[PDB]
């Protein structure tokens, strides 16, 4: 049963992702997320190999939960009635990283580069699974702020991977590709790199590029912060105007802004700590 096994506590929050609230593992104390969702608010389904009906959202969050990532893993799901129930892991002490630019405005360098290739990482993973997240954003990557790790949530807008084009979005326009705005179009990896365009230059500016329609399809990338030289190429590579002219998550990585990483614990203990 779901009650005997964890113990609920407050609300963390709500939204279009459900109600989301703290909780531990009873068997060993282990700090988790317990997510409801009800089933008249779930519009993408799907199927587990064995067959049973169930929000895309598990379908996902499956595929990409086995082993260790930068994903926050599904432990466990439930259904009720008239709801889904999904246990999922909870760092604590966390922070989001929005919260976490508007707090401290934008990002040094040597810890935009940590984030950002921890994303990428993260990124490549669920591709590598099968998985498109369709919604990286700084809202949707949450900060271990001790091991200095950086972990992907909110899979409830995701698709499977495909190399066909996609005709359908839910996720957050800011960060949706100008083919989105211009044609309803897009292909899943390209519009991936796009909106990991608009996350970096999130992270050295403290602010996104775009906020109308007109801008993101304008494409115009104006620096409002001193940012790096190597670094607006490849913000710039990043948002280019056609998909083609994107790079490949090979490129981004080998990329010189890119080079000379930070490891997650001495990310932490150099700007976290
Ligand atoms: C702007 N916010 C706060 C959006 C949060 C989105 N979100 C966070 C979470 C998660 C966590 C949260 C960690 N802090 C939170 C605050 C509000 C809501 C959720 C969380 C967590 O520890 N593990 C998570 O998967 C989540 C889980 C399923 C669907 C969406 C989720
Ligand atoms: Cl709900
Ligand atoms: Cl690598």
């Known amino acids: 049963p779901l009650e005997s096994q964890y113990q609920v506590g407050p609300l963390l929050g709500s939204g279009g992702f459900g109600s989301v609230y703290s ?13 409801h969702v009800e089933k008249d608010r779930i519009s993408d389904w799907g199927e587990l190999p064995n067959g049973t009906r169930v929000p895309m959202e598990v379908v996902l969050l499956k595929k990409v939960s086995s082993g260790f990532s930068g994903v926050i893993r599904l432990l ?15 760092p604590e002490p966390v922070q989001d990283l929005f919260d976490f630019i508007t707090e401290r405005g934008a990002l ?29 954003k700084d ?22 991977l495909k190399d066909t084009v996609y ?15 211009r044609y309803h179009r897009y292909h899943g990896r390209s519009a991936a790199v796009w909106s990991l365009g608009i996350l970096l230059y999130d992270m050295v500016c403290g602010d996104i590029p775009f906020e109308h329609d007109e801008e993101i399809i304008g494409g115009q990338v104006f620096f409002r912060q001193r940012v790096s030289s190597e670094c607006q190429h490849l913000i710039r ?27 997650p614990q001495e990310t932490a203990e150099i700007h976290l700590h």
């Not at 040094?108 to 919604?135: I, P």
């Not at 809202?139 to 995701?158: A, M, P, Q, V, Y």
């Not at 105007?241 to 930070?262: A, G, K, Y």
Request: aromatic share 10%.
């Open 23 to 35: 909780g531990i593992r009873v068997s060993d104390n282990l700090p988790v997320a317990i997510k």
């Open 76 to 90: 466990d799901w439930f259904e009720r009635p008239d709801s889904f129930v999904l246990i999922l892991e909870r």
């Open 108 to 136: 040094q360098e040597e810890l935009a580069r940590s984030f950002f290739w921890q994303v990428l990482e993260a990124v490549r993973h669920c591709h590598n699974c099968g998985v498109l997240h369709r919604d990286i």
């Open 139 to 160: 809202e949707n990557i949450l900060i271990d702020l001790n091991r200095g790790e950086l972990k992907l949530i909110d899979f409830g807008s995701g698709a499977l």
């Open 167 to 181: 005709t359908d979005f839910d996720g957050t326009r800011v960060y949706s590709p100008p083919e989105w705005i």
């Open 237 to 263: 590579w990043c948002l280019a105007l056609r998909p083609s002219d994107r790079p490949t998550f090979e490129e981004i990585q080998n990329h010189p802004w890119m080079q000379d990483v930070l490891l």
